[PDB]
Amino acid sequence: ESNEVLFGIASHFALEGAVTGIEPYGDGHINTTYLVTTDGPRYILQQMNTSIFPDTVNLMRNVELVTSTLKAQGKETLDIVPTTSGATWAEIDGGAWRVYKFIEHTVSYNLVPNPDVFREAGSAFGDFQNFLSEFDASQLTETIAHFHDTPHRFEDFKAALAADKLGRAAACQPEIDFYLSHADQYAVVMDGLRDGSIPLRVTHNDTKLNNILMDATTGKARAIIDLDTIMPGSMLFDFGDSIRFGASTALEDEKDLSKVHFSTELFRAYTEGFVGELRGSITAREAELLPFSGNLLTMECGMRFLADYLEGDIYFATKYPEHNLVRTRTQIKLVQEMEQKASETRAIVADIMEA
Ligand SMILES: CC(=O)N[C@H]1[C@@H](OP(=O)(O)O)O[C@H](CO)[C@@H](O)[C@@H]1O
Numbered sequence: 450e451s452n453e454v455l456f457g458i459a460s461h462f463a464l465e466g467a468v469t470g471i472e473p474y475g476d477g478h479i480n481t482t483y484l485v486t487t488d489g490p491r492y493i494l495q496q497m498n499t500s501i502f503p504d505t506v507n508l509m510r511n512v513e514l515v516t517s518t519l520k521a522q523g524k525e526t527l528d529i530v531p532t533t534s535g536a537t538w539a540e541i542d543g544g545a546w547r548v549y550k551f552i553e554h555t556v557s558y559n560l561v562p563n564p565d566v567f568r569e570a571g572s573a574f575g576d577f578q579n580f581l582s583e584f585d586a587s588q589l590t591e592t593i594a595h596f597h598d599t600p601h602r603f604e605d606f607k608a609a610l611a612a613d614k615l616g617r618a619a620a621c622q623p624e625i626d627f628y629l630s631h632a633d634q635y636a637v638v639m640d641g642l643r644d645g646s647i648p649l650r651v652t653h654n655d656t657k658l659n660n661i662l663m664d665a666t667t668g669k670a671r672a673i674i675d676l677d678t679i680m681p682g683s684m685l686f687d688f689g690d691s692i693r694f695g696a697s698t699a700l701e702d703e704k705d706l707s708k709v710h711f712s713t714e715l716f717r718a719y720t721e722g723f724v725g726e727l728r729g730s731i732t733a734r735e736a737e738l739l740p741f742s743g744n745l746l747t748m749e750c751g752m753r754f755l756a757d758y759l760e761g762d763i764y765f766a767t768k769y770p771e772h773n774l775v776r777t778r779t780q781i782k783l784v785q786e787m788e789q790k791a792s793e794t795r796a797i798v799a800d801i802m803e804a
Pocket of ligand 1: 476477478479480501593675690701750
């Protein structure tokens with residue numbers, strides 16, 4: 450996006466300083482995000498991806514409900530900066546744009562640097578789930594259908610595979626066959642939700658580590674910062690996805706696979722934090738599935754990366770042609786180690802399930 454256009458977008462919002470610069474920012478794969486520097490405060494400017502979130506009204510209604518409820522409890526959250534006409538987002542030339550106050554005095558991580566950071570992440574996400582349980586499922590309409598319905602994701606994967614639109618399949622048979630051969634594992638959570646053996650809860654659904662800001666002084670979680678996929682789900686979606694991103698010893702798109710490991714110690718630290726908040730609500734079935742929810746969300750996200758690769762990278766932002774193939778391979782490597790360490794993680798959860 451050109452500067453002139455971006456600065457044009459910025460003039461629609463009630464900013465409280467003269468804009469000095471607007472630059473791409475952060476690692477979100479879906480929305481396009483910019484840091485707005487002014488002669489005063491800073492702001493996050495985002496373009497909402499309307500092919501992924503077609504219902505902008507419903508999405509902004511959810512974000513607005515979640516944020517306003519958090520504000521009404523004196524909890525720090527994302528602060529929508531309204532347009533100059535007081536709307537919570539602006540439609541400009543076929544684009545959908547919103548502005549958040551920049552969250553000051555924070556750090557965030559793409560890679561956990563020690564167990565204490567990750568424990569705090571589990572504590573923050575566990576507590577977020579407590580907060581979300583105050584809502585009826587009916588107040589928070591799904592903003593994307595079948596979002597962690599892994600069998601439905603596998604259907605998309607299969608169709609992308611059979612289409613093989615770019616002829617990319619030939620160079621990634623091992624990765625493809627990994628997802629094919631695990632097909633029998635995908636329905637466990639959806640089946641549990643459908644038959645009542647796993648409770649339906651309002652969940653965050655994108656709980657990767659870089660969606661929590663930590664205070665730069667105290668190290669405590671300050672705010673959860675990507676509220677877009679809050680909707681009904683399983684607690685296991687939030688748990689498994691955190692483990693997926695944050696129990697790795699390497700970046701999601703690490704090119705050197707020898708650096709990619711699943712850390713049981715990181716698994717333990719997140720679990721202590723997370724289960725420590727949710728001890729009084731976690732059911733026996735949920736506890737039983739905690740380790741495998743890691744496998745499941747890693748496989749779901751990995752298959753999505755691979756599907757996108759095969760489709761010519763139409764869903765996730767990428768920085769080079771193979772980026773999605775590189776991403777899928779870290780996910781596969783992590784699942785391989787999670788399988789191998791399954792009894793260790795079962796023991797870790799059992800241990801912790803004794804507060
Ligand atoms: C709406 C959507 O598809 N969000 C994706 C997307 O999250 P972002 O926070 O938008 O980068 O990338 C994640 C993988 O890094 C994936 O886990 C998640 O489901």
